[PDB]
Write a protein that binds this ligand. Structure first.
Ligand SMILES: *[C@@H]1O[C@H](CO)[C@@H](O[C@@H]2O[C@H](CO)[C@@H](O)[C@H](O)[C@H]2NC(C)=O)[C@H](O)[C@H]1NC(C)=O
Ligand SMILES: *[C@@H]1O[C@H](CO)[C@@H](O[C@@H]2O[C@H](CO)[C@@H](O)[C@H](O)[C@H]2NC(C)=O)[C@H](O)[C@H]1NC(C)=O
Ligand SMILES: *[C@@H]1O[C@H](CO)[C@@H](O)[C@H](O)[C@H]1NC(C)=O
Ligand SMILES: [Mg+2]
Ligand SMILES: [Mg+2]
Lengths: 236, 236
């Protein structure tokens, strides 16, 4: 069945409008937290950075306040001296009675360009799936959710084996053009629109193509994407 | 504004060999035969245009010879931007099991369809797969583009001199074509070190789908879509 390209896709959860012109403010610095563990046990795994957040607490506050809000989602890979934004979306005109990112408007759906065919958001748009990342994708990933000025942080400690994966692709996450120093964030000099590419397919279609491309390359699709576990406190 | 759901039917059903690794890229620097390369002119006079790099070749005469020889054949298509000290490959496809009774690239097999990752959403092949369309390129995309068609060991060259207004296009994206990571010196080519699989990304949509999405995305950004694409005029 791997031959047949898909032609029907899950219907989107909400019909938004993409404001192609919207110039977001400079990125708030990611250098300051809930820590999740993601470790691959084999080469060429499809891994999932998924983690629930007590955010519906915040949206109930906004919903009772009868206030529609703007928000923002950004994924960073954190290096020892810099941080690379790899996925970024701005949201506006959100009804707080709905789920996050079910908003009337949004910026371009922005990605590090070489990630387009190797990554996608999960169904609730808050998680990130990586198809066969290389060993160099090991490290620390930080999800920053911005909702009405407040910021929720989630860290993912990701382990990829060093055995070569024949379908992996080197992402050079630490290249200085995309790996921004703490100063560049502080001076307000980091604008995702300038160096991240757009890919405005809805998540349902992006994910559908990611799975089809991965299996077509010979990957083994997991039965189920699982929430990344919190770091395990020791057992006496 | 409403997303496309019907696409032109493909010219030919082909199989993509995702594992295939082409041999190193032949140097595009043809210092010896600089004088006789078919050179075309392509100029935009307003910002944010969609331009086409189209040029007929004598490829059909080569295909007739192979057809008379009943010779199933291999072939390669590669586009470069030629800078003064290096050359950036920006699109690359290898073709195998080619039936010489058909048109170029109507082949039973091919490699991944490779692009500079940041071009995916801003470029696409034309219907015969030999031309190249750029949607809202920036001023820095001005310059010399060289198309290298390799067929049964033979190589056909077409050069395009492209001019883009200096005024900033608001929907354009900087491609950093001159970056050493992707712009390769003549020595790197001669030493057999340039492997497109290493550093170009894939976009395995058939041309008809890629071209359809390209047009829809351009128009959605407020681009003016030209009535039709024309062959570039020769240097006169
Ligand atoms: C998003 O938009 C689509 C298309 O406008 C909606 O699907 C249509 O919904 C209307 C009203 O119920 C039906 O009459 C049509 O038959 C549906 N299909 C089409 C092709 O128009 C879809 O329900 C919308 N979803 C949300 C969450 O607003
Ligand atoms: C096949 O193409 C790959 C690029 O996708 C080349 O990979 C690198 O080649 C160099 C030199 O041979 C090695 O030092 C690297 O370790 C290779 N990378 C990986 C990820 O293995 C490869 O050289 C090509 N195959 C050849 C030339 O036989
Ligand atoms: C491609 O294959 C489908 C069947 O999967 C067929 O119906 C279609 O006609 C084929 N296209 C061409 C151009 O042969
Ligand atoms: Mg692939
Ligand atoms: Mg756009």
């Amino acid at each position: 069945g791997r031959q047949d390209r898909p032609k029907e896709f899950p219907p989107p959860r909400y019909n938004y409008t993409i404001l192609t012109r919207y110039n977001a403010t400079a990125l708030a610095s990611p250098f300051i937290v809930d820590l999740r563990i993601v470790t691959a046990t084999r080469p060429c795994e499809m891994i999932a950075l998924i983690a629930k957040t007590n955010i519906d607490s915040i949206l109930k506050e906004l919903a009772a306040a009868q206030k529609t809000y703007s928000a923002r989602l950004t994924w960073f890979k954190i290096m020892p001296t810099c941080a690379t934004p790899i996925h970024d979306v701005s949201y506006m005109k959100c009804n707080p009675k709905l789920s996050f990112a079910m908003c009337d408007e949004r910026s371009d759906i922005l990605w590090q360009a070489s990630l387009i065919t190797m990554a996608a958001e999960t169904d609730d748009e808050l998680g990130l799936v990586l198809a066969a990342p290389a060993h160099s994708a090991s490290g620390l990933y930080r999800r920053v959710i911005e909702i009405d000025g407040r910021r929720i942080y989630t860290d993912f400690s990701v382990t990829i084996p060093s055995e070569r994966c024949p379908i992996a692709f080197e992402q050079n996450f630490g290249n200085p053009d995309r790996c921004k120093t703490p100063e560049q964030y502080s001076r307000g000099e980091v604008f995702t629109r300038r160096f991240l590419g757009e890919f405005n397919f809805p998540q349902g279609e992006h994910m559908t193509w990611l799975k089809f491309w991965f299996v077509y390359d010979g990957g083994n699709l997991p039965v189920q994407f699982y929430e990344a576990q919190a770091f395990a406190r020791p057992v006496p």
